[PDB]
Write a protein that binds this ligand. Structure first.
Ligand SMILES: *[C@@H]1O[C@H](CO)[C@@H](O[C@@H]2O[C@H](CO)[C@@H](O[C@@H]3O[C@H](CO[C@H]4O[C@H](CO)[C@@H](O[C@H]5O[C@H](CO)[C@@H](O)[C@H](O)[C@H]5NC(C)=O)[C@H](O)[C@@H]4O)[C@@H](O)[C@H](O)[C@@H]3O)[C@H](O)[C@H]2NC(C)=O)[C@H](O[C@@H]2O[C@@H](C)[C@@H](O)[C@@H](O)[C@@H]2O)[C@H]1NC(C)=O
Ligand SMILES: *[C@@H]1O[C@H](CO)[C@@H](O)[C@H](O)[C@H]1NC(C)=O
Length: 602
């Protein structure tokens, strides 16, 4: 007879209820299990009734794989799943955090902090639209974005993934969600999940609660703040996300006053689910539950109990799914965790799946393959890179002739610096590799290429990564552009207490600037010790981690557009000043939040 859940014309709650009613326990726990493509097999997926798969950073089919290779891999796995007794399609997730970043040729947008500098939530929405198209070009339906942490200490390895230290700004940027998922209906009820269909992806409001508030900005550490601070600083954005229909919510590795978020039922079930009435699914972070214990995974049985009772719906295992499934099966058999908990979890996961239309379109559209790196997206990244720049100084003394914007026609110029021609540096973490990488890792334009693409043909362009002072003084150059900065980093690799840029960086700037007037382009993921760099330069621009399209940078240096970005964070005088955010008592910044010089297009 008739199977209501397979009927695409039925209400999503009816289909969910129908399916749920036919699921054995193995099938239920299988849905709540997310595993890494690296441990996946058509059998594993089929036998274990696996409910979701993910690519961790750098987890790809082959280096330089095309978009159909991605689609082919995704479809392959999908086929195993569609071949279960219930044929419940799996959902494939990936960190498409500044474009479809793990994918070769994907358009790499400016990282978040640089996006905060734009104060343009519409442009952020447009990036989210572009991003969804580029993710769907590879056959993926779920992006682990946006990271709406409110970084309160830039020593935190992930501060670049936070739009601003000011939640008002982060709240404004949640426009990334309808960008990726498409806008919610007028009929829409906050907390309800939504995805417009196949050319859109399920989004994810990440690191549920207080990740950007850790002590000393130590990653995955503890957030010591009262409940009024939590809700006034770290909660706000999550509610906007609910009114925006964010599909999923990922839980943070961090602790709130000593309690792990992965084991916190008050905030996950009582608050996020009961109070905010979120109806999508709550997913753990990579080994998020193993981590509730110290040592991590020291009592995995406890991990499972703790996180499932707390409220998490889907578990990003991502490797030892055997152990996870065995254990959870055991806790239910022993009544330790009740079927209602399980059913609620599976209820949330199917709702998202049914809603986004996964049951109607579980495979990739070969037609979307050309979306990856589409030139129009690239033109958009270029826009956002340019808009995210913050001119910090444009002249050594109030009476100097402002250096920017530079003339395009000059007899000869120098482009110098470790970051002048390094695509991987320019893009930062979460790019091709998990930690990012160095060199020409993908398709794009470095500050050198962009400079050559900009200047008058009569303009001779000289590149020297690290020129000595005499080299510059004898070069008869009209001016120089020096690019220096941080190296790519992700997560704990980024936790940094000294916040000074690696050398040669200052020495090259001083070398070049001592000999010729220079515009310093600082590529960083955060505020870094800058008074020395400021001391040597005629003009200095904070480019943040601008992405693959370097022309956005020279679109401003050369006057094609004027500078408009403004600090999305406080620029500190020193690290012993930290934390120190707007509204503080010892507020004594080198540059206050909102700071930024302007110029006019030529
Ligand atoms: C401010 O505090 C930081 C702590 O995080 C510290 O930076 C970290 O320092 C540690 C060493 O103590 C370093 O770990 C080592 O990594 C070695 C490889 O280093 C390379 O790998 C990282 C990862 O790929 C690349 O950035 C680059 O480094 C050099 C110099 O500029 C450059 O010429 C290279 O071409 C560039 N190479 C690449 C591929 O990008 C990293 O910095 C170097 O490549 C490894 O073999 C060792 O076993 C060890 O584990 C961390 O990588 C580093 N973290 C980051 C995010 O950079 C700061 O240290 C200062 O800078 C470092 C770059 C060193 O030069 C060190 O001597 C400096 O003291 C610290 N600052 C101060 C003033 O204390
Ligand atoms: C935070 O960091 C210190 C290591 O710096 C560790 O010993 C401590 O237990 C961590 N706290 C949490 C909640 O992770």
């Amino acid at each position: 007879d008739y199977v209501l859940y397979k009927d695409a014309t039925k209400p999503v709650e009816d289909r969910v209820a129908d399916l749920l009613g036919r699921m054995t326990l193995a099938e239920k726990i299988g849905q709540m299990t997310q595993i890494e493509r690296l441990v996946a097999t058509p059998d594993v997926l089929r036998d274990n009734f696996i409910g979701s798969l993910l690519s961790g950073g750098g987890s790809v089919p082959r280096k330089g794989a095309t978009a159909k290779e991605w689609q082919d891999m995704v479809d392959g796995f999908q086929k195993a799943c569609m071949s279960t007794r219930l044929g419940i399609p799996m959902i494939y997730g990936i960190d498409a955090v500044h474009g479809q970043n793990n994918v070769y040729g994907a358009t790499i947008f400016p990282h978040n902090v640089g996006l905060g500098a734009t104060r343009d939530p519409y442009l952020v929405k447009r990036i989210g639209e572009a991003t969804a198209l580029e993710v769907r070009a590879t056959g993926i339906q779920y992006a682990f974005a946006p990271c709406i942490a409110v970084c309160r200490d830039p020593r935190w390895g992930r501060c670049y993934e936070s739009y601003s230290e000011d939640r008002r700004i982060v709240q404004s940027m949640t426009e990334l969600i309808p960008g990726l998922q498409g806008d919610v209906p007028k009929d829409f009820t906050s907390g309800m999940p939504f995805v417009a269909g196949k050319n859109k992806v399920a989004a994810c409001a990440k690191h549920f609660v207080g990740d950007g508030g850790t002590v000393d900005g130590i990653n995955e550490n503890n957030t010591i703040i009262n409940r009024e601070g939590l809700m006034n600083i770290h909660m706000p954005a999550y509610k906007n996300a609910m009114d925006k229909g964010v599909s999923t919510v990922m839980i943070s590795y961090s602790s709130w006053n000593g309690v792990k978020m992965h084991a916190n039922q008050d905030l996950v079930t009582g608050y996020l689910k009961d109070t905010l009435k979120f109806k999508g699914f709550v997913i753990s972070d990579w080994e998020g539950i193993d981590r509730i214990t110290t040592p991590a995974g020291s009592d995995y049985s406890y991990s499972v109990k703790a996180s499932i009772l707390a409220g998490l719906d889907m578990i990003m295992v991502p490797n030892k799914y055997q152990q996870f499934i065995s254990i959870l099966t055991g806790h239910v058999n022993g009544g330790v965790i009740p079927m209602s908990r399980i059913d609620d979890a599976v209820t949330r996961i199917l709702r998202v799946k049914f809603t986004m239309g996964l049951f109607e379109n579980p495979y990739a559209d070969p037609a979307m393959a050309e979306q990856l790196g589409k030139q129009e997206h690239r033109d958009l990244a270029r826009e956002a890179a340019r808009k995210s720049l913050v001119l910090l100084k444009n002249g050594k003394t109030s009476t100097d002739a402002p250096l920017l914007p530079l003339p395009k026609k000059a007899p000869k110029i120098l482009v110098a610096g470790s970051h002048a021609d390094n695509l991987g540096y320019q893009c930062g973490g979460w790019t091709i590799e998990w930690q990012g990488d160095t060199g020409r890792t993908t398709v794009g334009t470095t500050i050198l290429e962009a400079v050559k693409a900009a200047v008058d043909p009569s303009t001779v362009v000289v590149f020297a990564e690290n020129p000595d002072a005499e080299f510059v003084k004898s070069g008869g150059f009209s001016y120089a552009i020096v690019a220096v900065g941080e190296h790519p980093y992700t997560e704990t690799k980024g936790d940094n207490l000294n916040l000074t840029i690696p050398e040669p960086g200052l020495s090259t700037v001083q070398a070049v600037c001592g000999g010729v007037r220079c515009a310093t382009v600082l590529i960083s993921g955060r505020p870094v010790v800058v008074q020395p760099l400021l001391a040597a330069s005629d003009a200095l621009v904070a480019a943040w981690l601008p992405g693959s399209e370097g022309q956005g940078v020279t679109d401003a240096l050369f006057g094609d557009f004027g500078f408009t970005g403004r600090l999305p964070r406080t620029w500190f005088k020193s690290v012993d000043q930290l934390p120190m955010n707007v509204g503080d008592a010892h507020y004594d910044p080198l540059f206050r939040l909102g700071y930024g010089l302007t110029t006019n297009a030529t």
